[PDB]
Write a protein that binds this ligand. Structure first.
Ligand SMILES: N[C@@H](Cn1cc(F)c(=O)[nH]c1=O)C(=O)O
Ligand SMILES: N[C@@H](Cn1cc(F)c(=O)[nH]c1=O)C(=O)O
Ligand SMILES: N[C@@H](Cn1cc(F)c(=O)[nH]c1=O)C(=O)O
Ligand SMILES: N[C@@H](Cn1cc(F)c(=O)[nH]c1=O)C(=O)O
Ligand code: NA
Ligand code: NA
Ligand code: NA
Ligand code: NA
Lengths: 264, 264, 264, 264
């Protein structure tokens, strides 16, 4: 076909994609910064395309409604033909692989526990076995789906609590989960992807931390519509950028090099 | 096509695939045990196939000869049409993805440093900057290729040393690298995949250990010939087994649950 | 035939099927939780069907009226063609096997004695031989039928008392039997299935307990209309879920893991 | 069809079917005694048939050879058309239900641990975590198959040990397992069905006992060839005999009433 600008669906999620502080004065791709903004530029260079970053309209990662069977979020933008690629912290999952394609992972992660510092919790088993400290997840996305589907005893128990907890333990965005941890005086802990957890503990006011091991092991991938020819080049680009050390450099840049909570 | 037994290429590498102690009395797939033997059985169950485990004839993972352009090892078994699938600790790399297909990773790893306990080395930078302690890699495979291609300063320096070191610092198998570490009185350190390193430090005589962080981040995948229809089902099976927690259970079984070097 | 949503008849009985506390806000299968809700989801996954949980309209397990010969309850929903399957604590009995099909048991049980703690009763023989403490059963279902038909001396004696006792010793639901035990100051004991008894002694206020051995040994099965093709797949699914350990995990989840009356 | 004597396949296993002490002087069904001999007589009475008890020629319960796919044992007698019914302690399992029919259970059981008294083992986890005391199973049958197929962590670990243990930990008959426990001075424990374990601890010299809970929960059923019309009547007979209390009376007769190791 003719040359075409690639439509990239992505999501505002720190430090992957963020509005620049002066974004109102800026246009197009220049409005945004972060790990995935940098990654998109490198992928585009290696694959020889021009592109337009487009924040997903509904602010969602992607889930399939049980009733209507409609996908929302970034996954929906791909499935319904709006976007050519998703470059975001989009988790590779079985249900998604059935409907979209993913590159090999550009970053590893697992579900993890964020506490306000001093909360007496060390593990998922600890959380699951006490009744003083509430806990929840992002309200839509792979973390929620993981818990809803899991028959692993501890995680099934956690889901059975979370889905009925009152007031609701689910949040709309990571920033809301973090704020809830920070404001709840040790009485809320947040289950979130380790990559986000590990970012936030590097930010002021340095009052949150990861505790325990991860609950699972997975990866983020660059996604394309199922069968799109673009998937092959993008996958090879991810593998090249990984081997060359660029992914590690970008991770250090956006997570650690300017951390506000010390070193080591 | 007709029903067919799937030919699985694999490699003897502990604890992935090992001869059972009584293997001489046993036949077929029953001769073998380990993480990848267990994984193969689960993949086959989920994908509805019968299979035959076949140890790669040349004992190699897979590399492309610079002159003849011929692939050896497990990669060669796939490329030349001998095997239908590889179920092994086979690293997903760019050069390989161009010629075979890989599932999403079933295990994460990075290149790492093994020392005999007490060796005064803490990092790759340490190794690279001293001249008393020799170091090398497995003689063919992704670790060697990583170093040969790398322009990351420390790793380029290491390769430039290793490729000319005398006597040769390269070994034919992980077990030979481990034996060399154990017998060289602190004067040899071994660069190997973290998964193997972390296994060996759980085995008697408990005289080796991993030191430092990993040098890179990658994954092992289940490989199929390029464009084989079997790749789709096998990938979905890996994702399912991961989500269900089976991969983690197999890792704990073969690495840690019977560790001979303590707990914690 | 065409794809079809399976109609599942079931019954509100803790902890098998319960209304979620926020059920008024919820729709369809999401309204409900418990052991049989979890089991239904697993059976459906293994057998490849979609389903609709439907609480039996008359709140009954199933009995055949002596005069009209009409079946009520869940058994009636199956016999009269309203439901495709019953997934509930439905006891496998001879009279029922003549009119519906059952899977092999998914749970074992026997009739048992519940007392308010401190009641001086240790056995059925004890109950049968004194006249201070009244006792009864659920007013319709397999427990009542067991006593009505039994020629075992102790149980015949008990039935001969219960059927004429004034005020009536029969109750409409397990919760009513439990409340009667709790409110009757040791002057009522309740004969009920051991599985329910063992659940209730794990709940606050921890004032009831099982005493003695069970009076009989039987099982709950997944029921289908007689000769329905669905019975074969559902039976194989029950056997698979049993062997895999899932039934035991669900039992522990709903009976013991969150018990409110201590451990051990 | 014409009237016909039913061929019953069964197995010598105490106290289910045993040779009478004076069996050499006796003919036909009169040679044998035990729980299943008594049960066979009751089933035949209720179903209106004459029958011939026939001890399975190979002394096996039933397993399918991985290579030839041939069934041996009692299962084989049914599958290959030699016997009309199996009346024995034959465990209902998924793989068997695919090829033969089973009544609802006439007895419940689970895999369990037999020790020589004083052996410091309390649980499967204990057995699995030590290396001084060997343990095994009957060499063919549902117990062995359970361990071979299980992905439950503790049981997978146990299987991985047992299948390679030297000398072999497997035995040909329960009596051989019991003798090995008795003669091995606390250095062998035996994994066997709870019903057999509970029988043997009631026999002199009263030097063995069950320890711990059961590892699983299952049942024995009366088996018929798949689709045989005899299955319906036999199932209804089992349910009737259960409800009437006859199964419990037979269990007490053969296990406990003449126990040689005390009461209570
Ligand atoms: N990456 C997830 C979205 N997502 C993000 C998070 F920060 C988190 O904690 N959980 C989650 O599901 C997805 O792709 O759905
Ligand atoms: N996984 C590698 C082979 N392989 C194995 C090792 F144990 C190691 O240290 N290095 C390596 O290259 C490949 O696929 O080539
Ligand atoms: N399971 C029974 C119903 N049912 C329930 C009980 F909790 C009980 O104590 N008795 C009883 O008959 C049936 O299927 O009829
Ligand atoms: N009941 C089993 C046979 N069987 C008997 C035993 F006594 C025992 O311990 N294990 C076992 O498998 C079967 O049907 O295979
Ligand atoms: Na990290
Ligand atoms: Na690790
Ligand atoms: Na119990
Ligand atoms: Na018992």
């Amino acid at each position: 076909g003719a040359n075409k600008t690639v439509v990239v669906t992505t999501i505002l999620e720190s430090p992957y994609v963020m509005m620049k502080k002066n974004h109102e004065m800026l246009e197009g791709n220049e409005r945004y910064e972060g790990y995935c903004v940098d990654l998109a530029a490198e992928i585009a260079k290696h694959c020889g395309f021009k592109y337009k970053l487009t924040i997903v309209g509904d602010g969602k990662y992607g889930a399939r409604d049980a009733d209507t069977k409609i996908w929302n979020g970034m996954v929906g933008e791909l499935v319904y033909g709006k976007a050519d690629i998703a470059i975001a912290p989009l988790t590779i999952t079985l249900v998604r692989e059935e409907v979209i394609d993913f590159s090999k992972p550009f970053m590893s992660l697992g579900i993890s526990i964020m506490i306000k510092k001093g909360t007496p919790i060390e593990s998922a088993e600890d959380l699951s076995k006490q009744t003083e400290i509430a806990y929840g997840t992002l309200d839509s996305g792979s973390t929620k789906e993981f818990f809803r589907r899991s028959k692993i005893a501890c995680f099934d128990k956690m889901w059975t609590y979370m889905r009925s907890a009152e007031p609701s333990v689910f949040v709309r965005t990571t920033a809301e989960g973090v704020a809830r941890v920070r404001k709840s005086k040790g009485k809320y802990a947040y289950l979130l992807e380790s990559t986000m957890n590990e970012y936030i503990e590097q930010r002021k006011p340095c009052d949150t931390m990861k505790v325990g091991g991860n609950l699972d092991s997975k990866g983020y991938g660059i996604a394309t519509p199922k069968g799109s020819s673009l998937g092959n080049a993008v996958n090879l680009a991810v593998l090249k950028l990984n081997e060359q050390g660029l992914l590690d450099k970008l991770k250090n840049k956006w997570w650690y090099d300017k951390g506000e909570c010390g070193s080591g």
